[PDB]
Every structure is written in structure tokens, then in C-alpha cells.
Amino acid sequence: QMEEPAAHDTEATATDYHTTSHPGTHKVYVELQELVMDEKNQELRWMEAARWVQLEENLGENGAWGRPHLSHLTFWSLLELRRVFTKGTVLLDLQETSLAGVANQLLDRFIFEDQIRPQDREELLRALLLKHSHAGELEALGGVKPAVLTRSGD
Amino acid sequence: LPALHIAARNDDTRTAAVLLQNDPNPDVLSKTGFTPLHIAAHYENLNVAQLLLNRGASVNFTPQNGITPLHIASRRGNVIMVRLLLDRGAQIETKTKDELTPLHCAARNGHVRISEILLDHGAPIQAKTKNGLSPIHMAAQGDHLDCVRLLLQYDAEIDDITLDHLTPLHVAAHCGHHRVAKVLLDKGAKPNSRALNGFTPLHIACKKNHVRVMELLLKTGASIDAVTESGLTPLHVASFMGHLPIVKNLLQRGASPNVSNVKVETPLHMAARAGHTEVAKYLLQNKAKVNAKAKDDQTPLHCAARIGHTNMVKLLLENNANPNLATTAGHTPLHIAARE
Amino acid sequence: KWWSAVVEERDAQSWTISVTTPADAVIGHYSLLLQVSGRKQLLLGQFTLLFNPWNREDAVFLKNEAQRMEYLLNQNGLIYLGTADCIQAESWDFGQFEGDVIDLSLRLLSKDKQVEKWSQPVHVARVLGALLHFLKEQRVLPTPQTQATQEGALLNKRRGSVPILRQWLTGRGRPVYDGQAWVLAAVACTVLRCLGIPARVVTTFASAQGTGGRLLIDEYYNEEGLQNGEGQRGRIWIFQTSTECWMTRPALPQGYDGWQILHPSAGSCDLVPVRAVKEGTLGLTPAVSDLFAAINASCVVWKCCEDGTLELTDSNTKYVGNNISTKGVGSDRCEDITQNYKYPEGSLQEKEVLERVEKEKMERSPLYLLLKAPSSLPLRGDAQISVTLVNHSEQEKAVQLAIGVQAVHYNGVLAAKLWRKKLHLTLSANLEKIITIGLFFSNFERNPPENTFLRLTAMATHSESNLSCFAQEDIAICRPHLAIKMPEKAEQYQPLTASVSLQNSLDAPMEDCVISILGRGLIHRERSYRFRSVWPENTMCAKFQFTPTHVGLQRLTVEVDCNMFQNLTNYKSVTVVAPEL
Question: Is A126 helix (H, G, I), strand (E, B) or coil?
Fold first, then answer.
């Protein structure tokens, strides 16, 4: 068999990639999406849940946005965020224009640090490229429910 | 129409668009006879090239010269024009008045990529113009190295000749390019190959005074001793042309001034026919018998007397050639000195 | 011709305005202002204005299109190193179209304070050449005298041009030691490709950089066959890089458009057209004489002795300024443009120009040898060399033959004394005699440095006559070959599998084998992989998988490091096409 090598990190050559251009200051608009599946056909899709223009504004099951309000979290969220960000994967100054390239480079960087197994690359690349609906289509969909992926894709 | 070509030169799209909206003539001849497509191929204006090729612009529309637009586009070297003209249809194998193929014009200027594309599209590598020169011979003339490498890599018969039997080594030594000589040597060649005159490439290098080519040929192993069909030697050619450093190198690396031609003549005899002085001193310095007889037994004083050169004699008198010596006819250096 | 704007398309809530530009305008950051009769003037945005070799009436204009696409739009270049006998390409990345190059270049330019003379490329080119030579003289550190092999993997690896530009302007990265000072030309080319001036990087092997105005170079050699002492005012370098830019000369008399060499002087720079170098006109520009002296000048060699008296020696003549080469257009092969710099040697024309320039400057052996040596020598290996000797004298003669081998940097700087051998011979009866001798690396005295070239010298001293014969040759060191297997065409957004093969030709097992892959537009930044020990008999074979993203023509590079050697680079090209709809 052709023996595949192991990974190795060396930061001797990192400083040759530090840009000097000032990016500036910019305001932000945050959007959160998660995997769900609609009832008429067993098809997974990404659905938005809330926005953060000024305050957290959530999306109800009827499809109507509520009132803005302050952002309160839970302790398990912050604990797991610190734990998973301590061993997370970063990609700075990526040169892309379409989501497929970002997905492919992110998957390759995942494979490099042994986050996931190589035989799962196909399933995640199929997952991350589904269509992304919006608020107008929900009443056309008739409702959506949480949908976790499976190896066979069902 | 003398201005349609001006619109082609400036890539004036709308003017030519109106001119072909009204007029139905897609090709007219100038006084020279070149079509608008020929002048479009020169200045590389391709929007009008598309406009012409949309209607009636025959790619194989040869005047009495026979110069296709593809020939000019390969001449000046425009790549995208070659791809466009070949995509719309082109007959590669054509002839000019001088029967020049597009590969011929491509090889002469030095554009290597056009040659790659054309040889990919089925142009025959082996060919013979009016004389019979292959494209590798012409590209070897213009000192285009990587074109020689490309023609060798795809396909080339190296030891090809023409009507005057000329290996590419011969034209390389006649035009003074040692760089292509290196490639032709290490890939494959024969220094022993002789022309119609019977000349080695060493003889041509001795004639046209290129030195580095001589060094490469002798480091390969072209023989010092060689006989031209006249009967000469490279030492004799170097003496008759008046090149001193070639004589120096050839006499250092092992040579004999004592050599006889079909008429028995030393390089002293072969030198005093023109009177190069320093080559005479250098040949006399090494072992050469100045007391010698020619075909009619003329001494080198006899051959020197017809020149009228004064100080050439005293150097010959340094090795005391006697004026007692005379030819078969009885003539003496005094006799020829009074005759001339 | 002058600044203009037309309102071509009109909507009830929109205008489409077409701004046009004059052919001769100052480049830099502009700003658009709109002033109606009533209101204050309003800022509309910002833009930048550069040169275009596509316009016919502009000065810096290229007729052919493929020359434009190679010399202006390309980013993945080659730089040729090694001796003139074996030329080794090295992959280089200019990266002129990065984000920060334009603003950095304009900030470097704006230290001139002569604004109106920015409309012309001559002034910009001269100023930028002077500034970049000054910065190179500022920020380049000399080599560490102590031996650090464990950090030699980091001292001499190059990633491109843009990190060096950043480290020269701000000084927040890795420095560039004197071992690689030839990057400057490439850097300048980067700046010109940023600004709109087409440019390329040429390499002259065996150039006479040093003092100029004199067509003669002296070199001193030891009794044993080495070079006593270090340095000289004018020496023959192994190679030298320079920069060519394409423009038109209006200030000169008519007939000098085209390629020009950029020449900084020890600071005021200037540029000289190549046809001036070929024709030999010294008085056209003060820099032409030194550059023409830099291409075709001849050397004489002196012999030092124990008494201190110097002696002239009869040696074989060596050539200067041969095998001028650069990157070919539209491909990945070398092409020599050397016909643009010299006439063929020994023509009537070159003899004419030599006699004319010498006339203008006037106003201001019974035995010999010759040497056959190979053009390339394997690492941890051996080779054979041969010296012949021919005498011309009826009497027998005794001779002492010495052979010296030593490594040298690329600028003639001596590095280490390696080997010498002395023997006695007796030639008789005017017969030639050949001596063939092997050269093994195990017989050496020291390990050579990272980037050196060996100089092999031979000196035959006649016992009777003090006049001695001499010969020298240069040999580059070759490293084992690195095979890259990869298909020619690939589909976008698809997996692609490359293979890498290496054979341990060397006699030592490799340890700590660390390889790295990178490439612009293929992999994001840089990847590293580790391996087991490689025995001298066995090979290694590895496989990687990635996915192309940007359509067109790319190339990837691999780089191998181990304990025996560092920074072994290679490359391979690929054409990726858009997916079928």
C-alpha cells in the first residue's frame, strides 16, 4: 500500500503571511441557521432562527418575528464554546468567491488536523451544499422539524 | 475601401459594421492585392476579424503571391489569431510563391508556441521548400534555440540534407551560432558528414572565423586531418582566409604544417598567395620546411614575387631560401620579379 | 482626448455616466467630486488610475497580446540559477496582484515630492530603481560566520516576493542574508508589474560586475593552486540577475524604443536601451560604458610567489557574458535572448565595434595543457576528470602539476579550501600525455555550504622555465531528482490526487524527512507532512489529495527537507476548466 504520512505543524513560516493593510472598522449583522427538515417531504435544509441587528430577535414557528430583547446565555454554552474553540480550526484571509470553495478548503483543513475521518468528507460536503431558504417560503413549506444527518443520507 | 483597411487598422467596429450593412462586398483587393483580412491579421485587431469571419472571409483566399492570412499571422506571431483562424477552418498545408509552409514562417521568426500548436494540428514536420530546406534548417539559421529543442522533441530527422548537401551543423557553422551547435551535438549528429564540396563543418568554421564552434567540434572529436575534394586542409583554409587565432588553436591542439594537397602546396605556399604576415611568422616558427617545391616546383619566393610585398620576403630570407632555386621552366625569383 | 463624461443611459431615478480618461495623466489615488451651482462639492468615491499597455496612443504600449498576457497578467514565474553549463530553474511567485502591493508601492513612491513628473514612466522607473537599491543596501544582513546547520533549513528558504517587500519596508519578518542578495531584481519586477510597466527578470552568467571603464580583470592565484587572500575590486561572478522593462524613449533621438535594462549605481539610477549596448554608443548615457564593459571584457591571470614577485601565466581564454536566458512566453521552458546583447563572436561587425570602442578608449610556449571536466557532479558521489599535456621540444622536460578544488559563493567570495594534489611528471619526445584522475566527495576535507559552486584549477609549472600554464573550470552540484505525477486536466470542485516519488541516490539514510506542498489558488497556505527513515537503497512514495477552486492555469510546488539537504524544490502545472452545465 502507498503509505500516507502524518500531519506536522511548524510556525516558522507563518510570519510570511501577515498582511499590513488596515482593514478598518465596520458594523456587523449576524444570522444564525440550523439543520431542519420539512414535513411534506423528508428533505433537510438550513433554516434561520434569529438575527442580531441591535438585539436578539427570534423567529417563531408561525414564521413571524417577535420583539427585540437582551441576550442571555446558559453556562453550558459558554463552557462548550471555550472547550471547542480551544481546539478549533481557523482559516484567515481565505481567497474565495463561492460557498463551494470555502466548504472544500474547510473540509481539507479539517482532514489535516484529524478532526474528522476521511470517509466522512463526502457526507459533509453533500450536507453543506443544500439550498438555503428564507422567511418567505416557510408558509409554502407547511412547517419544518429538526433533522439530524445519517451515513446513508436518509 | 482604401479606408475599409484603415478601419481594420484602427479596429473601428461601427464604421465597418455600417460598411457591411450597406455594401455586400466582404473582400476587396488593394493595389498590392491584400484583402482586409490580411491587414486585420497584421495589426491583430480581432473584433473586426470576427466580423469578417462571420461573412465570406475566405481563410484560403490566395492572391498571385499566395500569401494566406495565416502566413502573416504566424509571421508576426499572434497566438490568438492562429487559434481563431484554425478554429474557423484552415488548410495548413499550402504553398507560397516560394512554396513556404506556415511552419516555415513560424520557424524563421522564432515563435515557438505557434510551432507547437501547428505541429499539434497535423502540419508535416518534414518538408522541402524550393531549395529543400527543412523548418529545422531555417530555425537553426536564426539562432532560435528552444525552437530547435521543440522540433527535436516532437519529431525531427536530424541528418537531413538539401540540394547543396547541408547538415544543420553546416548552417550552424556558417552562421556562427555555438549554442544550437551544442544541442545538435549532444542530441545527435555526425561531424564526419561532408557537403557537396566535401567540406566538414570544421572547414566552414575555419572559413568564417567562428572559434567557439571549432572548440565544440574538436572536443566532440571531428578529425584534425581531413581532405577536401579540392585537396585542401582546414589549416590551408585558415591560412588562406587570414585568421590568426584559428591557426593558433589548431596548431596548438596538434597539426602538421607539412601536408600536401593535390597540387603540392604548404600553408606557406597557401599563405604567400595572399600575404598574411603574422600567420606566416607563426607557421614558420613551428616546424615547416620553407625550402619546398610546388606542382611546377615554384618556391614560395616565386609565389611571393607576384604579390609585390616587400617585408614578406625578408622573413622568408630569414630561413634562407636560396635565389639559386628555380622552377622547372628555368624561371627564377629574379625572372618573375622582373616579369611582374 | 481630454477628461470627458457622457450621460448615455437615463432612467427616472438613475443616470449611467461614462467617464473617460486622457492618455497622459498622473497615477495615484484619485477622488471624484460633484459640484452643482447651488450645493457644496460632494465626494463621490475613490479610485486608482494605472497604465495600460492595451492603448495604442499611450507610450508604454505592447502590440502583441500573448506577450502582454505573459509579461503583465502572469504571477507564477521562474528564475534561473546555476552555472552556465547546467541551468536549474527555481519556481518563484511574484504575487503582484495581492491586496496590499498597490498601496505599499504608492507609499514608497510618494517620498519624491516632484508631482508633475509622475505622468511619465521614465521618472517613476528611475526613482523606484534607486529607492529599491537603497533599501537593499539598508536591510540586508551579512551571513552568520558561525555554522548553524540546524537552522539552515530556515535561513535559505524563500516564499516569494511580497514577504520580502514587507520585511524591507517595515522590518517585521525574516531577514534576507547575503547568501541570497539577488532577489532585488525580482522585487523590482514585482513593483513594475504592480504599476503597469511590463518587466521581466534576466540572468547573465559569468558577468564582470565590479569596477568598470577598464576592459581587463586581474586574478591572483596561489603557488598551490588556490587564491591567496580574499576579494578584488573587479571579479567574475558566477551569475547576476537584472531587470528589463519595456517602454518608449521620447527624450532620446529616434530609434531606441523597446527593451531597457534598469541599472542602479552606487544614489542615482538610470535605464539604458539594449540596442545601445549592442551598437556600443558610450556617450548616449553615462551608464552605457560600464554595462558594455560588464558583458564582453577579458581577464588575465597572475601567479603569486614566495618572494612576492607577481608573474604572468599563459592560460586558456575564458568567455564572459554567455548564455543569456530568461523565461519563455506562454510556456514553461527557457529561451535565450542573447542575440539581443552581442553579435556572434568573430564576425566583421563585432570586430568593427570592438575596434571602435577601443579607439574611443585610447583617448581616455613549448608546452601547454587542457582540461576536461564534467558539467555536473552528484552529491555524496564522485566523478572523473582528465588533463592533457602536449609539449613541443626535442628535449625531455620535468613538470610539476597541481590541482585545486574549492567552493565559492555566487559573488566570487571564497568559502572553504577543499582539496589539493601535487605530482611530478616527465614528458619526452614531443608526445602528448593524458592523466585521468577521480574526484570523490569522501576524499574531501570539509562539508560544502548550502549554496556554493566548486572551482577546479590546474597549474602546470615547468621545472626549467618559470612561465607556467593554467586552467580553471566551474562545476555546479546536482541533487537527486524529485518526481511529480499528476494528471493534466482536472474538473473544478473535484478531488485531485497527486503523487510524489523520491529515490535515495545518496549513500546516507535520510532522517527527519519533512515535506511541504503549497501553491497559489490550489491550497490555502502551506501543508506539512512527516516520514520515516529512508535507506540509501530504498525509495519513498507518497500521495496527497486536494481540490482546485479557481479556474484556469495553475501550478503547484513541492519542497523537501531532511538532514542531508534543505529546500529541494520542484513544480508542476495543471489546467483546470469550468464544470459542464
Answer: helix
Cβ contact A15–C173 (<8 Å) = yes
| Residues C170 and C264 grouped into a single domain | yes
- CATH label of the domain that carries residue C548: 2.60.40.10
Whether C492 and C450 share a structural domain: no
Are the beta carbons of A17 and C542 separated by less than 8 Å? no
Chains contacting C (3+ CB pairs below 8 angstroms) = A, B
Chains in contact with chain B (at least 3 beta-carbon pairs closer than 8 A): C
For residue C579, give how far its alpha carbon lies from the nearest alpha carbon of chain A (Å). Answer: 13
What is d(CA C170, CA C572) in angstroms, rounded to the nearest whole number? 33
Within this chain, do residues C378 and C401 fall inside the same structural domain, yes or no? yes
Give CA C567 to chain center in angstroms: 17
Residue C187 neighbours by CB distance under 10 Å: 20
**Same domain, yes or no, for C422 and C352?**
no
Which residues does chain C have within 8 Å of residue B145's beta carbon, measured at their own beta carbons? 335-336
A96 closest CB neighbour out of C103, C174, C549: C549
Interface probe, candidates C103, C525, C557, chain A, greatest A C-beta count within 10 A:
C525
Q: What is the DSSP track for B70-137? A: HHHHHHHT-HHHHHHHHHS----S---TT---HHHHHHHHT-HHHHHHHHHTT--SS---SS---HHH
CB pair distance less than 8 Å for C336 and B219 = no
- H/E element holding C391? strand C382-391
CA–CA separation, A75 and B167 (whole Å)? 88
Are chains B and A in contact at 3+ CB pairs closer than 8 Å?
no
- Of C235, C325, C269, the closest CA to residue C125 belongs to C269
Angle, helices C101-109 vs C121-139, to 10°: value is 100
C395 with C488, same domain: the answer is no
Cell readout for A152 is 446513508
Rounded to whole angstroms, the Cα distance separating B107 from B95 reads 15
Nearest CA in chain C to B78: C64
The Cα-based distances of C563 to C478, C507, C512, C568 in angstroms read 17, 13, 7, 12
- CATH at residue C89: 3.90.260.10
Rounded to 10°, the helix B145-154/B178-187 angle is: 20
What are the φ and ψ backbone dihedral angles of A17, each rounded to 5 degrees?
-125, 15
Q: Which of B146, B177, B209 sits opposite C334 (nearest CB)?
A: B146
Smallest CA–CA distance from C170 into chain A, residue? A20
Instruction: Write out the residue range of the structural domain in which residue C372 sits.
Output: 367-478
Q: Residues 274 to 293 of B: which have CB under 8 A from any C CB?
A: 286
CA distance C492 to chain A (A): 9
CA atoms within 13 A of residue C363's CA, in its CB half-sphere: 4
Question: Does the distance separating the beta carbons of C546 and A108 come in below 8 Å?
Answer: yes
Residues C207 and C347 grouped into a single domain? yes
* CA–CA separation, B133 and B181 (whole Å): 18
Which candidate from C66, C333, C336 shows the least CB-CB separation from B79?
A: C66
| Method used to solve the structure | cryo-EM
C412: left (phi over 0), alpha (psi -120 to 50) or beta: left
**Which residues of chain C neighbour A91 with C-beta distances below 8 Å?**
524
Q: Give the separation between CA B33 and CA C343, rounded to whole angstroms.
A: 38
In this structure, are C263 and C126 located in the same domain? yes
Q: Give chain C's radius of gyration (CA, Å).
A: 28
Breaks (C-N over 2.5 A) in chain C follow: 266, 364
E strands within C392-467? 397-408, 414-427, 433-440, 453-462
Record the resolution, in angstroms. 4.4
For residues C536 and C449, state if they share a domain: no
Which residue type sits at B209? N
How many inter-chain contacts (B to C, CB under 8 Å) are there? Answer: 60
